[PDB]
Design an enzyme around this catalytic site. Sequence first.
Site, mmCIF file in Angstrom:
data_model
loop_
_atom_site.group_PDB
_atom_site.id
_atom_site.type_symbol
_atom_site.label_atom_id
_atom_site.label_comp_id
_atom_site.label_asym_id
_atom_site.label_seq_id
_atom_site.Cartn_x
_atom_site.Cartn_y
_atom_site.Cartn_z
ATOM 1 N N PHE A 141 0.845 -1.086 -0.079
ATOM 2 C CA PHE A 141 -0.184 -0.110 0.016
ATOM 3 C C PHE A 141 0.779 1.342 -0.091
ATOM 4 O O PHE A 141 1.999 1.318 0.669
ATOM 5 C CB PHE A 141 -0.918 0.048 1.280
ATOM 6 C CG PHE A 141 -1.996 -1.280 1.389
ATOM 7 C CD1 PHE A 141 -3.047 -1.216 0.365
ATOM 8 C CD2 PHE A 141 -1.969 -2.080 2.185
ATOM 9 C CE1 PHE A 141 -3.802 -2.191 0.334
ATOM 10 C CE2 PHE A 141 -2.907 -3.012 2.178
ATOM 11 C CZ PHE A 141 -3.659 -3.191 1.170
ATOM 12 N N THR A 165 0.829 -1.523 13.726
ATOM 13 C CA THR A 165 -0.320 -2.309 13.797
ATOM 14 C C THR A 165 -0.066 -3.530 14.493
ATOM 15 O O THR A 165 -0.487 -4.085 15.631
ATOM 16 C CB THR A 165 -0.941 -2.631 12.646
ATOM 17 O OG1 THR A 165 -1.659 -1.722 11.822
ATOM 18 C CG2 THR A 165 -1.994 -3.877 12.668
ATOM 19 N N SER A 166 1.493 -3.991 14.357
ATOM 20 C CA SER A 166 1.748 -5.016 15.224
ATOM 21 C C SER A 166 1.770 -4.867 16.770
ATOM 22 O O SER A 166 1.532 -5.904 17.594
ATOM 23 C CB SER A 166 3.141 -5.784 14.729
ATOM 24 O OG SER A 166 3.488 -5.933 13.537
ATOM 25 N N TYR A 188 11.139 6.701 39.919
ATOM 26 C CA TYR A 188 11.859 7.868 39.375
ATOM 27 C C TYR A 188 10.759 8.504 38.338
ATOM 28 O O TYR A 188 10.886 9.969 38.029
ATOM 29 C CB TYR A 188 13.129 7.468 38.547
ATOM 30 C CG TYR A 188 12.712 7.077 37.213
ATOM 31 C CD1 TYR A 188 12.437 5.686 37.097
ATOM 32 C CD2 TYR A 188 13.270 7.812 36.092
ATOM 33 C CE1 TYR A 188 12.352 5.305 35.837
ATOM 34 C CE2 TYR A 188 12.906 7.478 34.747
ATOM 35 C CZ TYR A 188 12.601 6.055 34.608
ATOM 36 O OH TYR A 188 12.433 5.389 33.436
HETATM 37 C C1 LIG Z 1 -0.082 -2.941 5.997
HETATM 38 C C2 LIG Z 1 -1.003 -3.695 7.055
HETATM 39 C C3 LIG Z 1 -0.387 -4.121 8.180
HETATM 40 C C4 LIG Z 1 1.047 -3.744 8.453
HETATM 41 O O1 LIG Z 1 1.340 -4.036 10.149
HETATM 42 P P1 LIG Z 1 2.618 -3.231 10.805
HETATM 43 O O2 LIG Z 1 2.749 -3.863 12.154
HETATM 44 O O3 LIG Z 1 2.233 -1.585 10.735
HETATM 45 O O4 LIG Z 1 3.967 -3.412 9.837
HETATM 46 C C5 LIG Z 1 -1.101 -4.863 8.799
HETATM 47 N N1 LIG Z 1 -2.467 -5.151 8.704
HETATM 48 C C6 LIG Z 1 -2.956 -4.833 7.357
HETATM 49 C C7 LIG Z 1 -4.392 -5.007 6.832
HETATM 50 C C8 LIG Z 1 -2.367 -4.024 6.552
HETATM 51 O O5 LIG Z 1 -2.760 -3.707 5.185
HETATM 52 N N1 LIG Z 2 13.041 6.294 32.561
HETATM 53 C C1 LIG Z 2 13.115 6.454 31.171
HETATM 54 C C2 LIG Z 2 14.067 7.784 30.602
HETATM 55 C C3 LIG Z 2 13.931 7.496 29.047
HETATM 56 C C4 LIG Z 2 13.326 6.705 28.510
HETATM 57 N N2 LIG Z 2 13.327 6.730 27.221
HETATM 58 C C5 LIG Z 2 14.008 7.939 26.869
HETATM 59 C C6 LIG Z 2 14.756 8.390 25.492
HETATM 60 C C7 LIG Z 2 15.694 9.459 25.679
HETATM 61 C C8 LIG Z 2 16.159 10.010 27.030
HETATM 62 C C9 LIG Z 2 15.431 9.474 28.103
HETATM 63 C C10 LIG Z 2 14.616 8.285 28.117
#
Ligand SMILES: *Cc1c(COP(=O)(O)O)cnc(C)c1O
Ligand SMILES: *NCCc1c[nH]c2ccccc12
EC number: 4.1.1.28
Lengths: 476, 490, 490, 476
Positions: free
Chosen positions: B84, B151-152, B335
Amino acid sequence: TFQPLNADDVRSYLHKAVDFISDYYKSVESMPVLPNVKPGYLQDELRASPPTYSAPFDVTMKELRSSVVPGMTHWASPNFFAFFPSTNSAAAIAGDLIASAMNTVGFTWQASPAATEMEVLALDWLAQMLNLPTSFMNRTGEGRGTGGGVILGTTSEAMLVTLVAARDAALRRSGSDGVAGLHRLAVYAADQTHSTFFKACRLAGFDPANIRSIPTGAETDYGLDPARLLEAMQADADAGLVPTYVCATVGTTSSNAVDPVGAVADVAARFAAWVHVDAAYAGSACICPEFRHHLDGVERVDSISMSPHKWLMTCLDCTCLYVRDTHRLGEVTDLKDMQVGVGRRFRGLKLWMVMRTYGVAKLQEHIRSDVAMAKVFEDLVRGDDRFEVVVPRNFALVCFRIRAGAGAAAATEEDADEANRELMERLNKTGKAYVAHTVVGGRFVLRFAVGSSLQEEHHVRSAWELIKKTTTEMMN
Amino acid sequence: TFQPLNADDVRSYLHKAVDFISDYYKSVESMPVLPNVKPGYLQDELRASPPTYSAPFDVTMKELRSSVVPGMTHWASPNFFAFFPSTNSAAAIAGDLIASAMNTVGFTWQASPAATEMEVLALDWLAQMLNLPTSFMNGRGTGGGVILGTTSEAMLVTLVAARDAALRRSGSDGVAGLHRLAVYAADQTHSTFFKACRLAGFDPANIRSIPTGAETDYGLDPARLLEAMQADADAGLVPTYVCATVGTTSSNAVDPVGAVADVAARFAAWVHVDAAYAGSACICPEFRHHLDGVERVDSISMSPHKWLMTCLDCTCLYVRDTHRLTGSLETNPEYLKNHASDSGEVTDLKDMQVGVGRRFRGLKLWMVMRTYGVAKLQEHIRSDVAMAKVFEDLVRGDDRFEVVVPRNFALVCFRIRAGAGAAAATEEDADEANRELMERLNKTGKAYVAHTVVGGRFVLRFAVGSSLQEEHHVRSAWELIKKTTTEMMN
Amino acid sequence: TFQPLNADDVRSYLHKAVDFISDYYKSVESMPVLPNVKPGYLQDELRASPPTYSAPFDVTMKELRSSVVPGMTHWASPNFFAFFPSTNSAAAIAGDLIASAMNTVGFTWQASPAATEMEVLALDWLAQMLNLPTSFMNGRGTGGGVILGTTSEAMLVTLVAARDAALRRSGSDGVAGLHRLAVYAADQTHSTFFKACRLAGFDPANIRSIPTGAETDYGLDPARLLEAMQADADAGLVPTYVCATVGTTSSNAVDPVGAVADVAARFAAWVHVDAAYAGSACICPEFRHHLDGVERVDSISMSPHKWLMTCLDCTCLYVRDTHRLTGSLETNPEYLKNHASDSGEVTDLKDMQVGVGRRFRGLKLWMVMRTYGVAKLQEHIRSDVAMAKVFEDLVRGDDRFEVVVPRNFALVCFRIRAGAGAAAATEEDADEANRELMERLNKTGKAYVAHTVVGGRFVLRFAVGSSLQEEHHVRSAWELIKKTTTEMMN
Amino acid sequence: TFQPLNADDVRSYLHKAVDFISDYYKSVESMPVLPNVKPGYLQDELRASPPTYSAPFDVTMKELRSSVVPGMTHWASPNFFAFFPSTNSAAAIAGDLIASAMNTVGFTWQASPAATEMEVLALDWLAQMLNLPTSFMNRTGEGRGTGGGVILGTTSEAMLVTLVAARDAALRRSGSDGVAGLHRLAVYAADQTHSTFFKACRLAGFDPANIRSIPTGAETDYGLDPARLLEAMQADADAGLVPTYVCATVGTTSSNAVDPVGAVADVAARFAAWVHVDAAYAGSACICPEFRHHLDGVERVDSISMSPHKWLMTCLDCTCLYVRDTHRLGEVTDLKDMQVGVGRRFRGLKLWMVMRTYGVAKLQEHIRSDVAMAKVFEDLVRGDDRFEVVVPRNFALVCFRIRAGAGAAAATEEDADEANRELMERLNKTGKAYVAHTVVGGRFVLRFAVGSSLQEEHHVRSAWELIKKTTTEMMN
Ligand SMILES: *Cc1c(COP(=O)(O)O)cnc(C)c1O
Ligand SMILES: *NCCc1c[nH]c2ccccc12
Ligand SMILES: *Cc1c(COP(=O)(O)O)cnc(C)c1O
Ligand SMILES: *Cc1c(COP(=O)(O)O)cnc(C)c1O
Ligand SMILES: *Cc1c(COP(=O)(O)O)cnc(C)c1O
Ligand SMILES: *NCCc1c[nH]c2ccccc12
Ligand SMILES: [Ca+2]
Ligand SMILES: [Ca+2]
Ligand SMILES: [Ca+2]
Ligand SMILES: [Ca+2]
Ligand SMILES: [Ca+2]
Ligand SMILES: [Ca+2]
Ligand SMILES: [Ca+2]
Ligand SMILES: [Ca+2]
């Protein structure tokens, strides 16, 4: 007749974005780091429904200025001192801009050869910078390595996919019929390993009863005790459980503790358990020879990840996962299957541009100058008897606090906890700092994470003056 | 003294980047859509090792033009007809550029309030365009949404929520009962769904790929789904999750969402709707019927980074009960603690995803809707559909070819018919003639076509809508198909 | 196992090189003759350090096309009009290629007999074409020749021979008397002659640059030379060497070889004729008068790598007494001793040059003469002269311009005249208008013109003869001069 | 209408040349290395006058085959063992072919920027390979060096131009009015330094009486004794003469002796004399760490030259001259003025192509494998009591001879001299070897120079068998 990529809009929209970025970096220090907004503020500014008709891009940009920017926390501020800085660079931004415009989806090599080859190239280059063994490399100088890499979105994604691979490998080793023996598999990490790792364990289907958080104490500066690890893994093996995976962390989130990678690998080898090294933040420092000993033993582990989108000047997202001896899982491909979803953007272009434009030496001096600023701050804290540095500083993060006995408003250790909380809140109200906290050995502790890309040494010294001023006004 | 964000460099690097982008769009049509490079060319040209010293950004841009661009498959080309299209817009690119520069990490609301509040607003706006039930938006509602990369990941986190609820209510002893859970999808459901099942620990023996056939235009037959679920229940398994697809990847089949939901409700199974591609069409009232019954499902995802002019990554997930997701996904590390999170009045979007960190992806999506408006987004869907109809009717008026299934959106599935020439007497000959036609089309550099299998037959997909692509590109591609075919017959 | 001359690589690298050369000649006219690069660009693009690992030769050729070619000044372009053209031929390139592959080092005859014997043959053939006196060839003759890389080396070794004979006969106490020796050349003599004098230890105070003027068309006035030599002799200095030029670099002046020889013979001074460029013309009978009197000089050099289609390096030196050169230049190290050298029957060409080693440069020169023949070499000179005459007459028919000196060969010296427009009222204005015209012409990329000074006046040189250049290139360059000039006046 | 570079001729002539080269390399071993021609043979084969008319290139090529090739000494033969081999490579030939066709004259940067920049680049690259100090480099990683280089035609030209610079500098230091004090300047080298150096001294105008050849003996393996140098330079200084220049040689022509560079530089520093290091042949080996000690002290000398057209696979001509601290003599230019004639071909392109195509590691293994073949030969000679290795082998040249007492036909040392001469002449008559001689310590000695580019180890072992066979047939 509507062309969303017509030449005039592309040039004028991007030029306006670039003007905004230029102004933003020039003026971000003058803004309060932490915004003074309450939850829900934005829906009281912007319309509740999408507009029916189009508007000039100028209208969009002015809503960005009027309603978005004032509600942001300015990670780019030189006075951002929280978490870990999201260091960045002109080359990384340009590379992600170019990837956004080409907008290719590289789920196979054929879907875009250059994108896959550049991701492999950037991974192999950074592996050389980290002095990883050839067992973690796709291509070699003249031939092929025995390993591989993939550029993921997060460290959590790196954890999940190595957890899954270790899970399925232990299920086969233990004679499981499918997932029927999954309840026998156990996993291990120190209690300072990020909580997203234990979440990843649960996502992968490990049993909550078999997910082990190993207590750490100050006698190891909160690094994992390999003896306590062996004791826990042996007890599980003796009881019929299958030790499946150990996560060792180089540079923990809370206090930048360092787990002993080699010792952990040897202990896990008794049980054939997978060993992943999480160096999300501190990994970047290991391109410098005086930090590279922290990864000694990586040659015996199964996987390692680190995130250039923290400390290697590459905007999000960029997490690099390396896997040893990939044959247990010509054509030049990354490990696209060790990835939550194959089918995402060209993350490699900006990482290559960072390395190609600036070179190894500037990348190393970027690490060293951040560390040096961190040492300047650490030494200022150590010179004021009202404070303490609660753990040794390994990289560019310092953990400090107002001591008990600092003033009468910090007499008991419970009093000190409250004074440090009050200090942090006062610093953040000034708008001239953003400080957040952690807990180390039962005590409320201020983190001070040096390295926001615009931040220079006078910014750190001025933050320290402000901490001294604010503490003084509190204590009387 | 080294300043990676100094004003001079930020301005000139980005201006050089914009100049490249301008040239790229103006010249991409004249490049071959598919490259002619061998595996391994890139490390040959760039070197095996990173440079020790720095180089002017002009050099980086020169290696981009000389070594990277010639190895690319040009998704942006008007002659890209595969998979697509990754539709895009100046507004989305501008939004992602600004997000890359501000580079905030929005794991909590406090970590950047506007980043999370704009994402919520953007999701709400799209939900309105989609006419989703208010039960998916947020009074007393439990609905809500998150922007994810893929989507995954949307499939993964709803699978995990469904899994945890099935194990809990069925009395699993920890995860000892995971081998008892079963999941279902039509065989036309994207392969990444079955991969996400395996990631979440579902047993391969219990992952049901329900056969489909031409009787339903390869949509999921709800009677066959009820048969498979009831049989599993009768055998002591726990039917846990069903995935329905609106706009399948291969042939754009549509599963009946309402009837799938009703069948799955006999087992309290989670129902997710994957509308990755075709969901964007449902902002148009003539397509919104494909989503009827979504009011009875648990979750639905669709990707603006396919058909809504928002560059990758951008996938939107909506759920009727966010609490079922945050129950499995939330963490509370010390944190990250803050007063806003403690108050319960905000949703920290780390608790709606796999990871902690996340980009400000709401900005680009909001900029697209805010700058262009609903009417232009609707007309963008409609003009792509009309171009695909043009192509469909062209295929129909040539007796050497057949349209293989009804066209629901902007993907046409077509084939050299059996008995069209002497090189396609059998169906096995037609299978080989269509593969030859596809390899020839791609070799010209004026097309990129890829294939699928529909009911045992080798089929060509023609996926219209690459953003730079106009109707004359589609007409010229049909002329190229006719003429390549004619040369193949003699 | 690493084989730098393995058959596969030798064949494919050279075929890739030939393909580049073919493309280069076909496309060089369409490139700008002068590049638009900044000093230091190359190490930016290629790296600061050599690669550790190997790369396919296709990569080397790609960096040649991408980084080297765009930084070149294209001497081979038909629109290269500067200095003197480096004329070339398929035969000369083929000869040098084969010599590079055999890669013999011919310091002695024994070190490769054919390399030295073909060089002697090639020199003899050219001497015949030039109609040199037999006293320069080799019976009882003492004459002989050597191919050297440059006119500078030819000047150097004859200067050293003249110096050693002057010191010997004038009773120098070792080199204590070197400060007494004097040398002479017209002020139009190439600057490398005065540099070779300094290399040989001549005193800067004793190196005479004789003024010339329009009275002799800037040829050396023999009366002024006799005046300068006699004055030095009267003062106790030793007049040692005189250089006469036939075809000066700036304006193609010609020194009267016979009369210079007669003047210098009153002092027993060495006379060398530098005919680097114009000597090739003297294979044509209508130009051979410029060499009349060469029978009375000691040495003469000319470079086929200017005007005789033999790629660099190729400079031919002829002397009437080789023994005067080998007396200063010979060595007899033990490791080079052999029976042929001992016999006196061969000349080891290390004893005719500065260095020991030397390439097989006779091959290319012989291949040029053998393949094309005298008649084609003569017609090659004549057609270049005729094209230059065409240009000269074009300049003459435009009153805004002047031809500055008589045209002797294929270089025209011309200028925007004083009083040609309102932007050239004075001579100082014309000086600036010609510099502006030159910088404009070069900026178009359709010309490369460089300047000289003739009698205090800024002058443009137009040097015809670049091998790919045809008459229409010369006519179009004149049209470009006229139109650039007209745009400059208003 | 005659186009000497028309497309058809260019392609067909070059293709025929390439075919010839291919065949030549494939068949050169089957030819006798030394030709069986007498002086004057060629003029009896080819016409005495240039042809009036043109001929097909095929006619030219067949005269090359019929009359030129049979009269050549095949330097390219694997059985060429004389002098020093002119090692070569496909990349070098291709680069010189391309330079011949472009045919640019680079007497200024403007006359062709790429040609000048590539010559500087190739020089700076090779300087890094040699580990020369920054004082010998034009460009540096981020900035500029303080030195420079130029690609000359010969080592003799390198000697002349540094002699001239040292001459003029000493004339100014000594208050000479022009060249009036030239008769006071003295110059020095060991007697093993090439005779072309003393010739260069005379060319530059030094007095024959002040050109010093320092005797060497076997007690230093014929390297220059620094004490004898100081003794000679002091005596000249004491007598009113001006010590002006010392040439130190790393890898002499006759026996590959090595002068101690650092010691020579220190001794010359007493008198402010210029020190040039000639490493024409052995310099190439110094890109390998185990030979690089031979150049220790180069940091204190004024200039150094070496010739890739001997032992770095670059066809003639290519001699690299480096000069320290060039400021005693932005814009990126080689030292075009330290050159006999400015105005010569683009020599840099082939040297760059050699380095870029093959890389440092293959260049180093090319050195090491030649040395290893030389050691194989040296050890074979040492295993046969009839022979001796007369000096230690430092690189890929072995000096050996039939001893006195080897047979009755080698009883006295005068007899051995004649037997070694007879052996060399017999080897060359076979056509399966080309061996030439030298004199070391009064004795006639056979040189054996390993490294002809086509030569492999079996060629060297077979040469040794032939030497044994031939000696045996002589001795009875
Ligand atoms: C393209 C498409 C996906 C792709 O999934 P991603 O995890 O984003 O790579 C999934 N399902 C359908 C129906 C699609 O057309
Ligand atoms: N507690 C996580 C702090 C964090 C998580 N993802 C990141 C990306 C970039 C900087 C800091 C960061
Ligand atoms: C930042 C951090 C994480 C969070 O990783 P994500 O990319 O948000 O999944 C995990 N581990 C460590 C050590 C970290 O510093
Ligand atoms: C071009 C030219 C030269 C050039 O001398 P080189 O040493 O070969 O660079 C010398 N003299 C004249 C008259 C020339 O035209
Ligand atoms: C080869 C050699 C020379 C000869 O140099 P030319 O390039 O012919 O001038 C000089 N010195 C040494 C040590 C040599 O090996
Ligand atoms: N005696 C010198 C041997 C020599 C001189 N120049 C050369 C170039 C290449 C190889 C050998 C050589
Ligand atoms: Ca910094
Ligand atoms: Ca630079
Ligand atoms: Ca909460
Ligand atoms: Ca469209
Ligand atoms: Ca390779
Ligand atoms: Ca002789
Ligand atoms: Ca011509
Ligand atoms: Ca070899």
